[PDB]
């Protein structure tokens with residue numbers, strides 16, 4: 001079965017809002033809300049991957065970020081390891097740089113059912129901050 005390492009960024013502003021995008025209708029986890037991120041490539045580290053993926057997907061460079069959670073999740077047709085980085089400082093203003101919907105969402109209002117099921121413990125832990 002396909003095995004992937006994924007790095008994602010939890011982009012949190014000073015008003016306790018998170019920058020959330022929505023996945024394409026033809027993607028794995030189609031139409032789900034998501035933290036921006038993507039596949040860790042050969043020859044790059046998880047830290048380098050979350051920087052690159054946020055630059056590509058939402059046009060910011062995360063800096064002075066921390067590992068919030070690392071977990072593994074078995075989907076019906078693939079196994080992924082997710083690296084959730086908490087990003088509270090960055091250069092740039094996040095936007096839908098790849099044409100995808102993105103918007104700021106209050107942390108308290110996040111509904112884990114809107115995200116891939118792999119995110120459930122992370123969304124819960126975020127609400128405990």
Ligand SMILES: Nc1nc2c([nH]c(=O)n2[C@H]2C[C@H](O)[C@@H](COP(=O)(O)OP(=O)(O)OP(=O)(O)O)O2)c(=O)[nH]1
Pocket residue numbers: 006008027028029033034035036037038039073080082116117118119
């Ligand atoms: N980006 C992201 N992916 C997540 C989250 N939760 C979760 O289970 N996933 C899963 C969905 C996908 O199987 C995988 C993410 O891969 P991706 O489709 O974002 O990869 P990518 O951006 O490198 O893909 P692409 O540029 O090649 O289209 O991890 C999340 O919060 N953010």
Ligand SMILES: OC[C@H]1O[C@@](CO)(O[C@H]2O[C@H](CO)[C@@H](O)[C@H](O)[C@H]2O)[C@@H](O)[C@@H]1O
Pocket residue numbers: 047063064065066067
């Ligand atoms: O692994 C993240 C962890 O490392 C620290 C230093 O102890 O931060 C370093 O790593 C981050 C990710 O690459 C950098 O953004 C940061 O600038 C660097 O100091 C911790 O702050 C963090 O929890």
Ligand SMILES: [Mn+2]
Pocket residue numbers: 037038039053056057
């Ligand atoms: Mn991507």
Ligand SMILES: [Mn+2]
Pocket residue numbers: 038039053
């Ligand atoms: Mn990618």
Ligand SMILES: [Mn+2]
Pocket residue numbers: 036037038039057
């Ligand atoms: Mn992605």
